[PDB]
Write a protein that binds this DNA or RNA. Structure first.
Ligand SMILES: [Mn+2]
Ligand SMILES: [Mn+2]
Ligand SMILES: [Mn+2]
Ligand SMILES: [Mn+2]
Ligand SMILES: [Mn+2]
Ligand SMILES: [Mn+2]
Ligand SMILES: [Mn+2]
Ligand SMILES: [Mn+2]
Ligand SMILES: [Mn+2]
Ligand SMILES: [Mn+2]
Ligand SMILES: [Mn+2]
Ligand SMILES: [Mn+2]
Ligand SMILES: [Mn+2]
Ligand SMILES: [Mn+2]
Ligand SMILES: [Mn+2]
Ligand SMILES: [Mn+2]
Lengths: 96, 97, 85, 108, 110, 93, 79, 97
DNA sequence: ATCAATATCCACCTGCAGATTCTACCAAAAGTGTATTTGGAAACTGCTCCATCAAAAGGCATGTTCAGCGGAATTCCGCTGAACATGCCTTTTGATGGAGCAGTTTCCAAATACACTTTTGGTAGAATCTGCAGGTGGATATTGAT
DNA sequence: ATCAATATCCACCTGCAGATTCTACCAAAAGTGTATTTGGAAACTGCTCCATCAAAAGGCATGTTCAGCGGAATTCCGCTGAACATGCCTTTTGATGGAGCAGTTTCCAAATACACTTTTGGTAGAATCTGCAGGTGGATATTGAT
């Protein structure tokens, strides 16, 4: 049976910036739980948001406020930045 | 003249306030504070009435919760006077920084 | 002259603080406690208002409700009864 | 005809479609907006690189090239924001930041 | 006849079933689950109500108010644990004064 | 036209102690209590399910749920009352 | 006594990493107390997950979820 | 005849142990206890290796974390030796009850 | 300040658990096209209730005196932990039948559905009942000087 | 132990906010009965990796010596509680304006519902490159006897 993680990615992202740097087995297991940990953290606050506002949907605005609540100062800043970029660069739903 | 040995009326006070449950910070002054604090986030914000209460009941619950712990940090240093240093430790152990 | 007021953390009077610690069983309060207590009280409200308003802003509202203060509290582990939710 | 991936579109290297999959079936709400998964993935990859960078430095600072849990710990613990975000998380094999209280040392 | 009735419950089994559905917990919701929960929820409600009244009773009163609730709670190994990180508005604190803070040196009878 | 458990709480109260009365806010608190725990259980149930590759939250999840989220004596009595009602729900064929 | 198996040295070590310099004699049996009381609260929760998953073996992710609901989240073993 | 001053190997050990991240409890003993304890919940129970790994890792982490708090407690009492009364306050100011 | 006895450092080199470039097959995603479906963002607006100014009213914060007693600096000592060398028993290590956990096919008991039809718990309201806060008083404690 | 100042208690009192009591319009709910889609418990056994044990490692247990830490006893001052008085502003009761929350309807952009097509990250795993833990020997810092 197949099981997937964020490993490949975690690794490619590591390598992108710092090429001659590697990652131990446990380390990858840990960084994976971190992602999942936060994934839930966020998706859950989002769930509650919408719920709170008789809204049946999770937009980006929810994922936003969530991110805003969950993450700390300077890190909530950078996240949201990265969030709204990725989306805008995604609405180039044409050529690109 | 009549004089109550120091610490006697104080104990009268402890017994007193643990029997009652009314808030202990002046309402308006408190409201003021909340407003001030909030201003630093969003300007021209209207506060539902009860939001101040849920806010106040909240803080007061905490400060009292925190004081008990503080008082334990005092008796610990074989003292009976809460010192600025108790709060430090008291908050440090409930884990708050 | 006629139009002057002030910002308010000193609005938390020494007698009040004394009272809280009283209900908390404190019998003898050293003088450095007060500004200390104030220091704390501030950053508590600051922490709760923040998250609590992040909620109003999301509701597109401009009126901090109580289930606003409430969800904010819950979010943080401090759960409150007697105001909704 | 030809086509890239949604991750490719958003300039991301973390699986956008997957995060979208997990989001729907993760039972969080009836609907999952189309941008939400893109936004979320962006955040995740961010933090992902954020710990990674820091954890890397931790390692390199010690003339080592492979990140082991100790590095992640030292990393998380010195970073103010991460340390706070992960305060109630314990890292298997991370040890603790070295720290000996003054009242226990003679001077130095 | 209502499911509440069909179960001996006074709590809205119907309601709970819906809440659970339009609540986002599972894809599907077993038919018996909502029953089982409504029962668990009724129980607790009564348990506290019982201890709550008792506190009112002891204070010579007939109307349960928050201090009673707060007293019933902080004095029940069970409830005080289930409600450890919950705050009762207008509840007060269990009366308690530490010994190191009390007066004297042995002046009892002998 | 918001809902609430006030109505039943009151019944449940009176059933045992008919004389006892429940203040306005005392009632509001109780409502919170019920929604709170309701919340904890459902959520735990929801996870027990999810953890175990199931699409349905049965009374079986609800039970384990209770076991995980309640203290011994409360948990004990709950599982009973729980089983009880669900057994009597099937007795009514 | 197996709880006694938690040698006087191990307690000592942890307490070193913990930053402790001088350890009073009572600390040892005390630490054991804490330790057991912890393991118990965790395993009860853990095993409960086990019986629900109708298994006889206690998986690593069983400990993990237990630890999670206790607010003691762990990284390094899955989940 | 060489001999270290009372408390010089202590720090050597503190410094020595904070640099490492090796588990500090012998595995078998721990393993037994974990099992002894689980018996009271269900008999004839099998334990994944890692499941016992997860426990020791977390239990130790916890104990170490508590020892730091305990030490702070002791330094608050102007002492440098952690007494039973220390662990006690450390826990009380953390909720564990 | 002067040795020793040891602990700590660090540039130097090496074998093995474990990372790496490789080719590669693919169940399962992720993507895509047309069709069908809808839940929220916008536009309008009824009324609840948040922000105010008002001028009396006194409960309550603030400042100053006074000294009682608690906290801090300091001396001395009994004893409790740290250190240390030892040599035995308990834990660590490597290998193995096989107890149970995952992997997959399955067939209806059980759970959605969409439409109705019967029933019930919230809501603006009106005659009215009632538990207890807010007060006084005389008896009964509790404090503290003497 | 006694006497005076005070605080607390305990019983009878009562106007008033907030609970008790029917009345009844009703819309959002909850029950009901097939038609019908689906996930969970079942039966099997393929496949890890758990429990068990023998054998050489090495950490622990232990009794002795004693430094220095803790806790007692002591002394003293200045910090904070008790008491009392001054007048500031918080609290209270409206009365009044209108900012916004919130109930409704609405229609279409954006999202769900498959069928079908292209793409990909997971994997078993042989070939093989390599980071670094670990064991060596000599410079270099730290600790304590004197
Ligand atoms: Mn969206
Ligand atoms: Mn009083
Ligand atoms: Mn940072
Ligand atoms: Mn208790
Ligand atoms: Mn009980
Ligand atoms: Mn190449
Ligand atoms: Mn629509
Ligand atoms: Mn006046
Ligand atoms: Mn004096
Ligand atoms: Mn004294
Ligand atoms: Mn078998
Ligand atoms: Mn009815
Ligand atoms: Mn009264
Ligand atoms: Mn000393
Ligand atoms: Mn590929
Ligand atoms: Mn090395």
């Amino acid at each position: 049976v197949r099981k997937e993680t964020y490993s490949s990615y975690i690794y490619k992202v590591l390598k992108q910036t710092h090429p001659d740097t590697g990652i131990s087995q446990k380390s990858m297991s840990i960084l994976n739980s971190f992602v999942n940990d936060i994934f839930e953290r966020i998706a859950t606050e989002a769930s509650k948001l919408a719920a709170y506002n008789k809204k049946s949907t999770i937009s980006a605005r929810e994922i936003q406020t969530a991110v805003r609540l969950i993450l700390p100062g300077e890190l909530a800043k950078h996240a949201v930045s990265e969030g709204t970029r990725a989306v805008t660069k995604y609405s180039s739903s044409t050529q690109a | 003249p009549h004089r109550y040995k120091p610490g006697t009326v104080a104990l009268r006070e402890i017994r007193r306030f643990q029997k009652s449950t009314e808030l202990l910070i002046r309402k308006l002054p408190f409201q003021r504070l909340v407003r001030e604090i909030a201003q630093d986030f969003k300007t021209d914000l209207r506060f539902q009435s009860s939001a101040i209460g849920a806010l106040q009941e909240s803080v007061e619950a905490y400060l009292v919760s925190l004081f008990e712990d503080t008082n334990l940090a005092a008796i610990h240093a074989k003292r009976v006077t809460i010192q600025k240093k108790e709060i430090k430790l008291a908050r440090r152990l409930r884990g708050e920084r | 002259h006629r139009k002057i007021l002030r910002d308010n953390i000193q609005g938390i009077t020494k007698p009040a603080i004394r009272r809280l610690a009283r209900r908390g069983g404190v019998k003898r309060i050293s003088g450095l406690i007060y500004e200390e207590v104030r220091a704390v009280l501030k950053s508590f409200l600051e922490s709760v208002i923040r998250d609590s308003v992040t909620y109003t802003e999301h509701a597109k509202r401009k009126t901090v409700t109580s289930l606003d203060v409430v969800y904010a509290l819950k979010r943080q582990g401090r759960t409150l009864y007697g105001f909704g939710g | 005809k030809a086509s890239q991936s949604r991750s490719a579109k958003a300039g991301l290297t973390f699986p956008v479609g997957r995060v979208h999959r997990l989001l729907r079936r993760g039972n969080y709400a009836q609907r999952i907006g189309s941008g939400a998964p893109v936004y979320l993935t962006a955040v995740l990859e961010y933090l992902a690189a954020e710990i990674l960078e820091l954890a890397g430095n931790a390692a390199r600072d010690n003339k080592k090239t492979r990140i082991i849990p100790r590095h992640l710990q030292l990393a998380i613990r010195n970073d103010d924001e991460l340390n706070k975000l992960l305060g109630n998380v314990t890292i298997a094999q991370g040890g603790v930041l070295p720290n000996i209280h003054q009242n226990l040392l003679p001077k130095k």
